[PDB]
Each structure stands twice: as C-alpha cells, then as structure tokens.
C-alpha cells in the first residue's frame, strides 16, 4: 500500500477513488489518503487483524493494523479509515472470527450450526503473530448444545477479553 | 453523619455576612477554635490547647475561649460568627462561647 | 478591497439590504473602495454574492 498526501482538504482525491485515513503511533500521528482499489483488495485479504506495510510518499515505511472503518450508509462503501500503527511485543486487543469445522452431529438429526457471536475479541498475542481466524470443532455438538467462550483453544500467549461463560457457536433446533 | 457540620457550615453564610467565622473541634480531648476571614483563604487568630493544658480536659473550655478572645483583642477583631461543628452548643463549647462572649 | 454592486437587492433578505446600504452602494454599477478590516471585510462577506470584488 502506498498513499501520498494528507492535507485537511479532500478535493485532491475524492472522485479519484481514494479513502481518507489516519494512522496513529500513539506518539506519532499521521493523516493521509490511500487508493481505494488497493485497500479493498487488502482489507478483504487481511481484515481487522490485518498487518500490512505503509510507505508514505516521502520514503518512510511503517507496519500497521486496522482499528476501525467508516462507511457510506447508502452506498455501502468505505469513506474513512482508523489505522493502528503497530508496536512490537505487546499490541492491543484483537477481534477475530469464530469459524466452524466438520459436519456437526446437529445438522444430521434436526438443527443447524449458529455462530451466536461472529466476532470474538481477545486480549493480546504478541503482535507479529496474530491469530487471523479461530477454528472451533462442532462434530461432538448435538441439538441444545451451547459452546461457552471458555472452551475455545487459544494459540499460546493469548487470553480472553470475553466473559468466558458467554454463549458462542451454538446449534439450534429446527422450525 | 457529616450532614450536621456541612449544614451549619453553609448555614454560616461565608463571605456576604461580613463578620468573621470562628471554628471549634471538641471531639477529642483537644480542640482548636480558629478565627477565619472566610473569603480570603486565610486564618487570622486561633488559640489551641495541646501546647500545655493545665490539666482540665473539658473544664478548660472557658480558658481557651478567654485565650482566643484575648488574641482577638490584639489582632483587632470585634465581630464574630460562631461556626460550631457537629457540636450541639451545650456545655464545653458553650463554655468556650460565654468565655469569648465576655472576654473579647 | 475594491467593490462593485453587480446584482440586486429586490427579493433579497432584509439584513442583506441594510448591508448593501452600509457598504455605501445604492444602485447597480456603484463601485467603491474598502478598508481591509474585520468589520468592513466582514460586511462584504455577508453580501459577497451581490458584489464583484477586485483585490
């Protein structure tokens, strides 16, 4: 990704298909503007747990993560982006997608897999190595079976911002 | 429970009164009776009772009333307002009173 | 700045009238010189659109 300018004035890029953005170091803070096309390919690939390299039209290239995204409600498209300039050894808290794997023995007698909370926000990994997904097995799961936030296998050096008796990926009855 | 003190405290109209207010503190067996010009964050006279007391523990009220009012003579204080505390104006603090109330 | 009244006051809001009045213009084609200060240049801002402004 290679933005260029950053003035408080948008007419330079608006139509040209660029998004207004800000990346903050927490010590260093920088406004700017990225090619839409790019950040689209990108944010689709890497999502919120992203991590990609950002070289401002001045030479200096810094790594970063995606902290928030701001949409046109009516066009359903990016107009602005909040960008976290990553640190090194401890970052912030990462929201990551619960998935599901294998034909559950719920969908075979009556019900269906229901990811009651799509996105699970954990505390920390050590940033360099962020979990980007989060597989949960479901094959054991019958109909009427809730998976609390505890039972999720974290990949070492990871904890849970979640209340870990909160219902996540649960299988629901029919009708 | 802090209600009695902040009660009478606000009930002593601080500045707009003109007069000076006069603290006490007889809860322990030591008091502090300060004289304050309210408005200015400054405390004028005062006359404690923990730098030698004669011996009397509550009998000495009249004494420090007279001692304070004595300091008030010199500094030039003739007007007053009685900032009691959670103290129900009866014996001890009444002594400090009557004492200052004549010995000004 | 310099100033010209090149639009008109009719069907224009009361204050914009009275401001046209102040700036000293009482007919189209009226031009004038003005003293770069916040109250006069702030009298030209509010009726900007009625004025051809020079410098």
């Amino acid at each position: 990704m290679e933005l260029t300018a950053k003035p408080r004035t948008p007419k330079q890029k608006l139509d040209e298909s660029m998004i207004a953005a800000v990346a903050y170091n927490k010590e260093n803070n920088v406004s700017f503007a990225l090619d839409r096309k790019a950040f689209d390919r990108a944010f689709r690939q890497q999502s919120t747990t992203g991590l990609f390299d950002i070289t401002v039209e001045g030479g200096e290239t810094f790594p970063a993560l995606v902290k928030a995204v701001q949409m046109d409600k009516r066009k359903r498209a990016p107009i602005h982006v909040d960008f976290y300039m990553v640190t090194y050894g401890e970052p912030v808290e990462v929201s990551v997608p619960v998935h599901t794997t294998g034909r559950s023995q719920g969908e075979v007698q009556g019900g269906l897999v229901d990811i009651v909370v799509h996105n699970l926000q954990i505390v920390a990994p050590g940033p360099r190595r962020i979990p980007q997904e989060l597989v949960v097995d479901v094959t054991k799961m019958n109909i009427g079976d809730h998976i609390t936030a505890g039972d999720i296998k974290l990949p070492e050096g990871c904890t849970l911002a979640a209340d870990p008796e909160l219902t996540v990926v649960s299988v629901l009855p029919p009708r | 429970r802090r209600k009695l003190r902040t009660r009478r405290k606000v009930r002593t109209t601080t500045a707009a009164s003109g007069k000076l207010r006069l603290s006490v503190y007889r809860s322990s067996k030591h008091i502090y009776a300060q004289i304050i010009d309210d408005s200015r964050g400054q405390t004028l006279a005062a006359a404690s009772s923990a730098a030698l007391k004669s011996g009397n523990k509550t009998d000495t009220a009249a004494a420090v009333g007279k001692a304070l009012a004595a300091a008030a003579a010199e500094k030039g204080i003739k007007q007053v307002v009685f900032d009691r505390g959670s103290y129900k104006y009866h014996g001890r603090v009444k002594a400090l009173a009557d004492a200052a109330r004549e010995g000004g | 700045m310099k100033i010209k009244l090149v639009r008109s006051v009719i069907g224009r809001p009361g204050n914009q009238v009275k401001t046209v009045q102040a700036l000293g213009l009482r007919k189209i084609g009226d031009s004038r010189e003005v003293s770069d200060t916040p109250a006069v240049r702030g009298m030209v801002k509010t009726v900007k659109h009625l004025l051809e402004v020079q410098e």
């Binding site: 689709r44 919120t48 995204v69 409600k73 929201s95 229901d114 629901l172 029919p174 009708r175 | - | -």
Partner: protein, 136 residues
C-alpha cells in the same frame, strides 16, 4: 406486528438511517434503499414469504419493527372535529437500514427468499453479506 401499550398518536419527518447499516445475527442481509414507511402486514408478508421458501428451518431475523401509529379519519368527514384514530402501524425504515437477516441457507436460497420478499415491498432493496464489523 403491533406494540403492546404506549401513548397513541404521532407525526412525520426524514433523513438517512441511524443504526444500523451493518450485518449482525446472520450471513446474508437485505437493505432498504428508499425512505419509506413500512406497515406490519408488509413485513408479515415478507416473513411468510421467506419462511415458506426456506421451509424448515433456516434462520430469520426481522430487524425492523413498527412502533409508529398512523391514523386515518373516518369515511366522508369534513376536516377537524379531531385527529384520526389509529388506522395501522408503520416502521420508519430510512435508506441503508438493514431490514432483514437470514442465515443457515445457501447463497442461492438467500438470493431467492430475498427477491421474493422484495417484490412484496414498497421500496427498492439490495442484498449483501457481512464484513461490516463496526462492532460485534
């Protein structure tokens, strides 16, 4: 359908949709495009359409809900004498607002059940699919 207890009468006004433009509770979602009013029965209609097409069972999230009382005067009365008495209920769906969420069904199924619901609707719509993690 209806609310259960309230105040009675109301009014009318508009600009773009507050919350929420994003896709929770599901994998596929249907979104307004126009500043309509939406009556119970219209939703009821979309609910029954989609519910049938999914058969048993899928999963259907009817986000929008009619809290707004609309009134209509009696037949053939000269204006005044009062305000009209609660004809029916509308839900003030502004553009971009997500009306529907369905999940537990394929993309195909979702498309169709949507289109079918759309033809029952006062306004143009569009279907879409997640990524809108403004929060969760």
């Amino acid at each position: 359908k209806r609310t259960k207890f309230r105040k009675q009468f109301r009014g009318r006004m508009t600009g773009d949709a507050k919350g929420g433009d994003y896709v929770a509770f599901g994998d596929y979602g249907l979104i307004a495009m126009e500043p309509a009013w939406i009556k119970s029965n219209q939703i009821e209609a979309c609910r029954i359409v989609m519910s049938r097409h999914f058969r048993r069972g899928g999963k259907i999230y009817i986000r929008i809900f009619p809290d707004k009382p609309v009134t209509k005067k009696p037949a053939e009365t000269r204006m005044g004498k009062g305000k009209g008495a609660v004809e029916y209920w509308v839900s003030v769906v502004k553009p971009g607002r997500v009306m529907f969420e369905v999940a537990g069904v394929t993309e195909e199924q979702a498309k169709e059940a949507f289109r079918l619901a759309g033809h029952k609707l006062p306004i143009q719509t569009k279907m879409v699919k997640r990524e809108v993690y403004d929060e969760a």
